[model samples]
Target: SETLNPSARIMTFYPTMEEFRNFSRYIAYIESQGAHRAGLAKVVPPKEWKPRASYDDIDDLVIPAPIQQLVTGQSGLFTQYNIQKKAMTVREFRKIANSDKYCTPRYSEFEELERKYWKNLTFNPPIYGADVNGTLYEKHVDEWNIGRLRTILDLVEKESGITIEGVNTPYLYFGMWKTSFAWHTEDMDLYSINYLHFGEPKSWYSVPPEHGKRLERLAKGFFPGSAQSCEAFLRHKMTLISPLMLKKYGIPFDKVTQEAGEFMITFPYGYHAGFNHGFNCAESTNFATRRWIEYGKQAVLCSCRKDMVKISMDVFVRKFQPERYKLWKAGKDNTVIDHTLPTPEAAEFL
Candidate 1:
């Protein structure tokens, strides 16, 4: 087994479809607390490696100054547009987003804003399919249909003799400096690929899945009286740690500074967190492979217990397993199925 080697885990590739066609053979090497970057030149729109028109329109959209409730915990889910408390119009957000004062900020002022904003706010609007009105989807769906990791993963799943719907289509993300995401894995242990559509870089830090427990323990030790679980730490009660702190505690991690027109591929269950370096737009989505089925099942069960499973496991198996059986009975060499559950006790360890 190529175990997690956090020291040199990240790999950069300028891959072609020919390489992706042979992904199954090399995919194991790509797994295990890994992050890969497939440069976004020939693989994205404009063919010259640039931001898309949708991102430009979003950039030009105006943003109003955030009101009091906007920064408090009163806001709604990040994906919903209208259910938020005391909501502002998308036009209002667009006005603020496009304001002259939005992009240019004094270094110290922006730094202080980031310091407070990181822990206090969750006011993000959806730019893609999560749109309540569906117009964003209608207008920009084709823009996202270009040759990207999502398309490549779909091709691989279909041609490799599996019909699992393991991936979500890519979503567009827009944020200014001070915006950040909480620590989490991609839902259901699926691999995720995020592409920087445009603007300043984003900073990323990832902890290997194996060290997740130790990290939780360390967080508990640091905040001894707080909630005694990783879930609490993930919910923003604990302070963020740097790569140096992780090393001191013998936890393994990797960091990346992702720039415009670059891609970041996060392996399944690789716990990651990051923040925008400045005004930026990006797109990301989840995917899985035949190799991910076992993990997928475990993740599905976990989600079920936590009341988080959005799609039923029975439905998934019903839809995909019939064809999987056909391939297996045909004795296909590249079927990519694992039959042995050697240690049932260890199946849900992760």
Candidate 2:
């Protein structure tokens, strides 16, 4: 049962590390084509940081300083040395800004500023940190747009006896980097599942009971992402007074990977901001659930719906890796078609 406070929550399942390879490859192929790369863009460099909590000071650099680097893979060239000693040389600064090989900063006045103030350019995230725009769907959706969702549904129903819904999909899927998206909770009648394949996300949440007043305060001031005050409160590390704090606030913590992959579901009014290319192919079958019924398997009803939480949910079966799926198929005593739980449904829909 949900706690009385009904704090925003998460549950994750993981695949063995050995299983990550095929899954990773699958994600890489489809995701690369889709244009959403995980995490901040490589163009931004790891040394650059966001003005969020934990690494707030690093991302919010304001003077000649090195930036905070995320530990995930590699840190930006200057991040390690800068945070360690609180200083950077003009030469180090030049290396980064001049990283672009083609468009060189040539004018003497501009070049002079580059050299003179290089050491003085404080790392100010709000001002200096780059706003990373991952590949936009508008830029690369020509070949792999809505058609992928339709195909996935078609394959699922053909193989399984289940009737997966596919029509009347509610929201059009979008590429990562939400600065362009106007901020607001979705309509109450709508619901969604936000599955991720890579990267990380930082979300600020509050319950719906307080939604009306909270949403009104969103653009005006008190909401989580809009104003500085609310952001400060939500990102406050000192407020992590319990074990749950670690789970709620920590990124790259408690991750679950299925042999198939990783995913997360979001309900209406659920507040979230995932990292870049948050999904391998952040596709949604939102309306497909309704469309699948067209296949005519009335004997089986879907286990999910866009409504208030009434039962527990878990994502598995056909969602597993190819090998796992093979093993599962071999082990099943009887093939019940689409009417079966998980697999038949997933095989039919996935």
For each candidate, the alpha-carbon lDDT, in order, equals 0.46, 0.26
**Model 1 residue 343 distance off true place after TM-score fit, in angstroms:** 19
Weakest 10 consecutive residues of candidate 1 by summed lDDT: 126-135
Model 1 residue-pair collision total: 12
Q: What stretches of model 2 exceed 4 Å from their correct place?
A: 1-6, 13-182, 187-189, 197-213, 220-261, 275-281, 285-350
What lDDT tens digits, residue by residue, belong to model 2 across residues 1-350? Answer: 12221332233323343332332232222222221111111111012211122321222222233333221111111111112224443234333333442112333543342332223222321111111211212323222222233433343445544442322231222222210112223322122333321232222222232232343343234233324344222211111111132235342212112111133333223233221211112333321232122122211121223112111111223443333455544654233322111212323223
Candidate 2, TM-score vs. the true structure? 0.26
* Steric overlap count per candidate: 12, 27
RMSD of 2: 19.0
Please give, for residues 215-270, the per-residue lDDT of candidate 1 as tens digits.
66776676564433333434331145545466788876765667787767665556
What are the candidates' C-alpha RMSDs? 9.6, 19.0
Best by TM-score: 1
lDDT over C-alpha atoms for residue 17 of model 1? 44
User: lDDT of candidate 2?
Assistant: 0.26
